[PDB]
Amino acid sequence: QVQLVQSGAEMKDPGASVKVSCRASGYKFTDYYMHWVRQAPGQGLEWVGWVNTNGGFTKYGAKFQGRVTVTRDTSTNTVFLELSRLTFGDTAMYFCARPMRPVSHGIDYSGLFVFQFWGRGTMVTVSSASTKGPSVFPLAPSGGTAALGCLVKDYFPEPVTVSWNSGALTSGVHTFPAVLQSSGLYSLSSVVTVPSSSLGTQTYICNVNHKPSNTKVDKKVEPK
Amino acid sequence: ALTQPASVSASPGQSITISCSGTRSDVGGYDFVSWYQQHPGKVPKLIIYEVTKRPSGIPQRFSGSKSGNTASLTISGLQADDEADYYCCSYANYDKLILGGGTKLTVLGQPKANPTVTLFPPSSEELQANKATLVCLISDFYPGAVTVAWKADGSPVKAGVETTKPSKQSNNKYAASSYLSLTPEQWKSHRSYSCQVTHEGSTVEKTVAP
């Protein structure tokens, strides 16, 4: 019967601000605090802060001091999370979560220190206002196997395709998901596991294509 | 803030235990440890609180304990649906909540496979552009989760690291990658850099130098 309903995903420029909403129902609103918990893509849960809905008192996590402001509207049972001066590091799912019991002020705070009911989360994506082509660097090789590859560094936006030897080479090829970096740019690598004995006689070339920047690169990857 | 293993696994019907190590300021100082289950792409779910208690609806085969600065979650009678990421959480001095980095629980489909690790040096092409990236490749492993720790001449490096979520290879084993950003001066000046990879059944540390 407890429900927490959050506003929709947001896309923002660096430096912008955003306000996420969380609508509570199925309990007496001011009897409970509300938490905000975030999760950057592929990362762990992080506590952002709490608000006492009775009165509005707030506390924030260490890395979230200042650029985060949590409020509520008791007349509409709504809790808000505002993020100002957005950075690429702020890209994350933001969840509101209700603790399990009212706090007894000056007596018992045990009720506060859990996330019992969760909203579905609101994605905030801080997106690079740019197009950059990648630099392509060889990953030089050297159980009878060896790995080699190409590092496709600092590009935006997605995607980048990578083939090997004009598509001829498939076995042992692995192309990773891109990593979002603090700069707002992506990097990825593509590797291939090959017989060690093929090094120095077989030729390995990665074919990289980043269409948004019209970057097409064929990089020969030679042993050290 | 709290330390958990990257992954744990076992067969259907068996049991696993997930550790959560902290300090006197948090896990060791209070009985305010909670655990959360997150099924892929779903909302986290409270499963344990106050070290040992369970909210309503969570079966008895989920249990929690603590000894000193380490809390543990134990799940017995493992089922396929238990496959999920698990996070521990604790109150900490002062007026904060801190969480572990998460643990992937795999209900084994196949026997475990040890990772093979390759550490690539910066290329001369990157170096001549006044930059340097070490690339740690982790290949052919199962269950699909690892911890990657970077070291400079034996000591920890936390700045300039990015790591991919494990991905699935064509041959259905798992791979991961990690990237350490350095200056060319750091690369040329240290005796060595290393990538240390911790997987469920083995640890591998690879070292590279100019």
Numbering used by the authors:
A (entry chain H): 1 to 52, 52A, 53 to 82, 82A, 82B, 82C, 83 to 100, 100A, ...
B (entry chain L): 3 to 9, 11 to 27, 27A, 27B, 27C, 28 to 95, 95A, 96 to 106, ...
Provide the authors' original text about this structure.
Two moderately broad and potent, clonally related monoclonal antibodies isolated from a single donor, 3BC176 and 3BC315, recognize a glycan-independent epitope that was proposed to be located in the vicinity of the V3 loop and CD4-induced (CD4i) site5. To study the paratopes of 3BC315 and 3BC176, their corresponding Fabs were crystallized and their structures were determined to 1.95 and 1.89 Å resolution, respectively. Like many HIV-1 bnAbs, the 3BC315 and 3BC176 Fabs have long CDRH3s, both being 19 residues, in comparison to the average human CDRH3 length of ∼15 residues25.
The 3BC315 Fab crystal structure was then docked into the EM reconstruction to identify elements involved in its interaction with gp41. The majority of possible contacts map to gp41 HR2, with potential interactions between gp120 and the C-terminus of the adjacent gp41 protomer. In our model, CDRH3 is in close proximity to W623. Nevertheless, in accord with the neutralization assay data for 3BC176, the W623A substitution abolished binding by 3BC315. On the basis of our modelling of this complex, the 3BC315 recognizes Env mainly via hydrophobic interactions and shape complementarity in a quaternary-dependent manner.
